[PDB]
Amino acid sequence: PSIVIASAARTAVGSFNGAFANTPAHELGATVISAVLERAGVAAGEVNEVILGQVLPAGEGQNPARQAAMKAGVPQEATAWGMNQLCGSGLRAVALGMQQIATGDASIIVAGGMESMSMAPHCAHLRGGVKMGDFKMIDTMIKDGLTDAFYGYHMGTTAENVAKQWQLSRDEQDAFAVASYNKAEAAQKDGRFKDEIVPFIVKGRKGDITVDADEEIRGATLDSMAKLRPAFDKEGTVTAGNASGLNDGAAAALLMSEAEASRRGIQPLGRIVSWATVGVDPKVMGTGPIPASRKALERAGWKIGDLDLVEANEAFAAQACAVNKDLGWDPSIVNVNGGAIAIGHPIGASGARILNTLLFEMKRRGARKGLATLCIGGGMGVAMCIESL
Amino acid sequence: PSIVIASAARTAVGSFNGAFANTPAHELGATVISAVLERAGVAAGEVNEVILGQVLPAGEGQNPARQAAMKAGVPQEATAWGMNQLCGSGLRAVALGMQQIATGDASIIVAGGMESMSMAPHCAHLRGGVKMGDFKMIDTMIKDGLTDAFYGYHMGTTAENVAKQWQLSRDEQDAFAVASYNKAEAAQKDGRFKDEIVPFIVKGRKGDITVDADEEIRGATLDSMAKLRPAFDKEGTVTAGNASGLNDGAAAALLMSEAEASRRGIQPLGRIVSWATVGVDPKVMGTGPIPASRKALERAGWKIGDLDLVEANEAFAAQACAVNKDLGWDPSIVNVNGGAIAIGHPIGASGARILNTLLFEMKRRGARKGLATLCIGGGMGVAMCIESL
Amino acid sequence: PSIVIASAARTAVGSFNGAFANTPAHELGATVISAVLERAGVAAGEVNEVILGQVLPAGEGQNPARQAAMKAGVPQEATAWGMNQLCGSGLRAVALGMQQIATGDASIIVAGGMESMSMAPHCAHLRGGVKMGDFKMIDTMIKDGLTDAFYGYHMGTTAENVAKQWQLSRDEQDAFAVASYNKAEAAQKDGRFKDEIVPFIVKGRKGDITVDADEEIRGATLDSMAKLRPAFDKEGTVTAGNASGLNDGAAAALLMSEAEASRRGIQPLGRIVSWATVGVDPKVMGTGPIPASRKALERAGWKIGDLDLVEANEAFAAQACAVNKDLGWDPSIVNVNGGAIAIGHPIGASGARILNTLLFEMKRRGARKGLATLCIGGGMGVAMCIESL
Amino acid sequence: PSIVIASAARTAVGSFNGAFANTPAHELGATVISAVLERAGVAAGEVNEVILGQVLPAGEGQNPARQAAMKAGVPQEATAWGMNQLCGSGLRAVALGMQQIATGDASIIVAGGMESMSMAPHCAHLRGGVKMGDFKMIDTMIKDGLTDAFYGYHMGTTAENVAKQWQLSRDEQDAFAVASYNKAEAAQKDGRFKDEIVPFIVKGRKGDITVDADEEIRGATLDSMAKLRPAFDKEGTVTAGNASGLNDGAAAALLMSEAEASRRGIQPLGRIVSWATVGVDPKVMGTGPIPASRKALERAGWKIGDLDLVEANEAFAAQACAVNKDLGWDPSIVNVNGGAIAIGHPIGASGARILNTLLFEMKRRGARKGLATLCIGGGMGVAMCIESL
Ligand SMILES: CC(C)(COP(=O)(O)OP(=O)(O)OC[C@H]1O[C@@H](n2cnc3c(N)ncnc32)[C@H](O)[C@@H]1OP(=O)(O)O)[C@@H](O)C(=O)NCCC(=O)NCCS
Ligand SMILES: CC(C)(COP(=O)(O)OP(=O)(O)OC[C@H]1O[C@@H](n2cnc3c(N)ncnc32)[C@H](O)[C@@H]1OP(=O)(O)O)[C@@H](O)C(=O)NCCC(=O)NCCS
Ligand SMILES: CC(C)(COP(=O)(O)OP(=O)(O)OC[C@H]1O[C@@H](n2cnc3c(N)ncnc32)[C@H](O)[C@@H]1OP(=O)(O)O)[C@@H](O)C(=O)NCCC(=O)NCCS
Numbered sequence A, B, C, D: 001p002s003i004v005i006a007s008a009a010r011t012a013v014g015s016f017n018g019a020f021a022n023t024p025a026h027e028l029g030a031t032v033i034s035a036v037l038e039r040a041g042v043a044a045g046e047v048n049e050v051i052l053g054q055v056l057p058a059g060e061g062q063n064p065a066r067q068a069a070m071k072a073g074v075p076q077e078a079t080a081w082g083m084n085q086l087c088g089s090g091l092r093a094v095a096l097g098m099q100q101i102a103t104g105d106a107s108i109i110v111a112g113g114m115e116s117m118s119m120a121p122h123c124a125h126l127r128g129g130v131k132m133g134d135f136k137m138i139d140t141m142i143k144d145g146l147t148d149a150f151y152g153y154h155m156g157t158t159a160e161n162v163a164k165q166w167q168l169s170r171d172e173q174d175a176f177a178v179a180s181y182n183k184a185e186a187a188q189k190d191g192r193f194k195d196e197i198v199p200f201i202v203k204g205r206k207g208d209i210t211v212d213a214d215e216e217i218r219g220a221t222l223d224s225m226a227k228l229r230p231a232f233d234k235e236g237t238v239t240a241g242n243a244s245g246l247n248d249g250a251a252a253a254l255l256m257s258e259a260e261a262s263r264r265g266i267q268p269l270g271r272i273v274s275w276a277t278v279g280v281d282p283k284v285m286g287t288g289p290i291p292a293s294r295k296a297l298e299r300a301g302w303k304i305g306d307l308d309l310v311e312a313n314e315a316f317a318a319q320a321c322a323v324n325k326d327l328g329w330d331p332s333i334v335n336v337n338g339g340a341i342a343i344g345h346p347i348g349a350s351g352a353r354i355l356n357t358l359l360f361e362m363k364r365r366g367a368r369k370g371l372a373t374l375c376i377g378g379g380m381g382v383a384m385c386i387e388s389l
């Protein structure tokens, strides 16, 4: 069978404790679900299932994916569930939703990801009681999202391991960072994000605020990156500038068979040709996209040179430089409008975020063969190949 | 294609703050993952992916499914992720794992569920700061697992609504409870749970303790159940006895193609013929399995009378009577060895728990056509049809 | 015997989460202790005991009064302790320190009060453990400082009771408020607070900041005060403007016998002639100063008309108007430089704050007979009479 | 003037999380206040002021001393306040109340101490917000009661400093421990605690329980105490047996002039002749009573040999041996009925607890000149001399 992406939308990537500081994840997910239905002309009463990836759902209630679907207008007859493959969750939900229609068990799937790292609460197991002494209040964002459970240190330390393993100097990593900021700043000015971004209405008590611009996009220079202190180790290279930040947002895509799009007169953004996921050593989780993209290309029967456009998520400057240096694809086609270093890294939603950036990127310049991939904590990677119709 | 279940295992369902009081979820998941590999003769280096459902992973670290696979012995080459469809998570992971091999994207899948409601922490959003006044510490088990996010009350209140519409007397619900305990009492005595249960070693500081028996099995009487006070409403019918409890445990199943099983000389427990999931009104979420089982049966080409054994999860006595009364299947084949009212309700693992109980019961008494289904909070249901080889 | 006040000092009253947001109470107290020693020519090695009132010391460590004395330079040979009579703590410590020298058990006492309501933590009894359900995180400032333990409502409700019992209109309370702001702002412009205020250096990571002005002194308007909604009752008269705020600060005074001051050539600010404390009904705790000041005046043998200057703490506009209406003293001599409505209300330190304001105003204009008094939560009041040497 | 102790009472010292696990301090204080009034024939409407020492009042509400007086029956006209000199609060409150009558400002004072270390909550300053990362939940009992704010370690470490500097072997410390337990067991068997102890009725949901016996009194052996591991240092000498525990309780005494007692026909337990408090190095806070008792004896004009009975609080076995070795008084008259090692150490109430034990023992065996003293955290000590009428 053939599965296409009829429409795709995403909210503007918000800053940590920024515009979406007090906005739950499912409310951001409800906006993109309603948006992909409007952009494709499909009614809510036709969605079979909603698949939204989310890593930090603590305190939001029973199944925020169902809450997002019901709030967006999807009726009670449909189903919904959340998945967690860390950073590659947003892209795997699209592949999982692709398999739902592939196995003949569904006809229309709204799949994507949503994440609100600002609303992540602090937790502590208190059922057994604390008879005496102090106890830690654990940050769910850091513990369940940003710390490798096998070695105990942050994901930035795994980037330091990649930097030591590939011999990536502080100047070479900062040079890759400023390139991402310069490509993202030009894209926001030229309006290359307006098609992907659906405006979100932050309902506040002191009036309403419309968010329709990635607020983590700033202007960095090569000298403003050499003054940043290392954020993870006292003798390291990864700083707050050459590393992706903590962000909120949501993204989704409307999936359907290739015959259904022709029946509805829908012109899909692209067709899902192949997907893949492979694991690596958690010490060097940043090398995840290397065998994942090659396995995706191997299943699609495509060479690396056949690709016309690449979206490789920039979790860190060290991991992004190695993947580009190793795969050897033309860096002029990788993250043409910037990357997660300049846009943001909403863990649950970043998988579908770079998919939105890629799908509209293939349409805007006439690219035919695209590829999106991300690195995953704990030593994993996911990749998907998209062809234009 | 054809997907079979080569092996299945489950831990004993532990009580709230009982044997697994201080045991993380992924440790229980590691035992079942390693068990299904031993019972089938498949090495750990052959698992492509691990799909484990889990509702309450707060404070356990990055992707507890990955931690369970690595601790069980699954190498770094494989991938892993967690899913959340509330109570139907344990069963949907099997269907999702079936689709991985169906689409030719995987060869060996270890799928199931794990949940540790005792290790569920209390949380509170504290990033924005508390300027003044008291703030609540939210229990993640109740909030993210046992409260409908659309009406705000407990799952027990939804059972009262099902009881009001289906005319289920106070005595008729207690009669279903004692029937579940008496069938569970006979199953534990006759040893019909020893094959499915894999022993877990609770390593404590005062020696080691082996857990290989469901510690929630007691002897209930009809008069000891009519004196229980309603635990959810001041004037109701749902009590602590006729409702599922808070429990810990894990369960899984090894998935593989039917040709691969014959090539390895494995005798599969059964073949996955059909699956389905549909949503219902959140007011009567206990009626989830009603439209789900018919959709699963219609895809398999089976009549309702064709089933030889049924495992319908007993979230509440009210919901179980309604699901049985509407489909009209012979009550002698539903939960022959007892149900969740007497065994326990590990949210993430209950979907695969009743699958293990069904698979080993179908094999020991020669049943050919089986069906497992559960109700899901928020108004959903999941069902799977299994045939024996 | 005769006990005089050789010197007195106070820190600038800081706003809630303002200049002293991250400054512990004992650090503010150490500055005032060092100040009263410099202004009197007495060394730190001569202080026999340090008595500092403090209402909210939770989480600050063992006996913050001892920490303030040690940090200020008082040697280990001396003693120190903290007391708690709520809002009258700052003034009762002076009377208690006066009794130390009166009974011949001490010769030089540094007495006063300190409070940091911004550093008040949230607490919860967790030793018995929370098996199930949510639990409240109790604000120590609200619970242990601003809530009557006999009727359960805020201290602002007791002001409403005083307003209802004394028939104090909303316009009369706001008129008293703007009068307090105008007297304090004009006093701050004319520099009538520089003598009392000792500058505090808030050592922050982004440089040092000197605080030498009560930062809650603002310009209020009658129309900007009549639009404020009542903060305690939905249909009431006490608002955030006509009520004292939550504030941080410290104040103290160096006590010594009248003969020792003449031996040291010190000109004391005043002599403590009489003191008194009496209790009232907790429903109308604002009437505390009424029988306390009358008992203090009778012990000194003074009539109400004999007073030349009065400092009656303005906890609320309702409580302050009632005290003036009952005692009947000339309002032109009460709070000449403003009150707690415009300066601030650090509960533990407010008792010594108005003492500093009274002592320095009596000295500059030649007043001989003064009286300071405050209302106390739970239905109490404290008052002290000061005569000039 | 002359101030006598007309009556005295105390609650049984409860164990940590024991009989008084859920009993607030002021409820224990209300029982002792009512008890000292009945034993002297004085009504509650005659008490001028209530002075209760308390170290851990976090979360109990506004001024727990006021709550204890009101619940015991003291009318609203009277006043009440709490003081905090750590371990010397219970005894210094008696001295402060003695000075109230000495300066002619009061006639009848109910003074003592109360402490409920089991009800001590965990706290954390959360107004400024936790931007990122984990934060500790501070135990108010450990932080504000048992940790030296100048060196950061527990009070047990100060005992280790005393033990190393005074040449006190670990076996000599354990030998002092069993002597305290054996003297307490014999005193409890012979009923020498019945006069001082007033029964407390713990009102629980499962019926009422009368507590009239110190539940921390057990039978210890020399070999069961020499096998205990040091609780403060990994290679130390202070164990859980030779150190005082965490306990709850309350104690008080009714103070009045010697002439007023004769007017009422009251036979006082003793007359307060002298009191004193002096500070020492916080490194060796256990040596507090050494210069404090010498100063108290010098104010009374008594030599050490003039004492007939001594109550020296046993905070630790190391500090108690050093105080006896330096002062050189006959150990046969010190703690005849046992000490805090076997009875308990309620911080706020220990000062008045050993006062009750001293007052009733001096009366029962005819002792004339007595002395009570305790060591105080942060490097202080307090002592009081009592003579018989
Ligand atoms: C690195 C990290 C800790 C930054 O945390 P942060 O401090 O709250 O973010 P900030 O923007 O405040 O960075 C701190 C400083 O750097 C500055 N800064 C950020 N980006 C900059 C840039 N491009 N140029 C210059 N300065 C920059 C900030 O303005 C700030 O200024 P300050 O010195 O006054 O504080 C966070 O982004 C991170 O850990 N990212 C990786 C997390 C993650 O998702 N890992 C998994 C990926 S798979
Ligand atoms: C978990 C649950 C049992 C809570 O009841 P509970 O009040 O917390 O149970 P308790 O903590 O009071 O302790 C268990 C009590 O039940 C009693 N009990 C348990 N099984 C019993 C039996 N078979 N016969 C008689 N009494 C029994 C115990 O003796 C105890 O009595 P007690 O209250 O006097 O001490 C249940 O009411 C519930 O809330 N389930 C929610 C989980 C859920 O939603 N499942 C469906 C998912 S859709
Ligand atoms: C009354 C109380 C709850 C105020 O709470 P608060 O909101 O945190 O204090 P605020 O100053 O921030 O009041 C908030 C609003 O009122 C405004 N406001 C405050 N004082 C004002 C004034 N004098 N004129 C005009 N506006 C004023 C603030 O600017 C703010 O407006 P905005 O936030 O809408 O822009 C608090 O001050 C209080 O409870 N005090 C009681 C003290 C007490 O009990 N003492 C012991 C009694 S013995």
Ligand SMILES: CC(C)(COP(=O)(O)OP(=O)(O)OC[C@H]1O[C@@H](n2cnc3c(N)ncnc32)[C@H](O)[C@@H]1OP(=O)(O)O)[C@@H](O)C(=O)NCCC(=O)NCCS
Pocket: A132, D087, D146, D155, D156, D218, D220, D221, D224, D225, D228, D231, D239, D240, D241, D243, D244, D245, D246, D315, D316, D345, D375, D376, D377
């Ligand atoms: C010493 C201290 C750390 C121990 O706390 P604790 O361990 O909770 O006290 P416990 O009652 O639980 O004693 C626990 C252990 O010691 C043993 N123990 C206690 N008292 C004993 C005794 N009298 N004889 C023999 N063994 C004893 C217990 O049985 C247990 O050993 P176990 O593991 O074999 O069961 C704690 O009491 C403390 O900090 N005390 C200091 C109090 C203080 O500083 N007061 C102020 C003085 S200035």
Ligand SMILES: [Cl-]
Pocket: C048, C105, C106, C107, C108
């Ligand atoms: Cl002196």
Ligand SMILES: [Cl-]
Pocket: D048, D106, D107
């Ligand atoms: Cl009197």
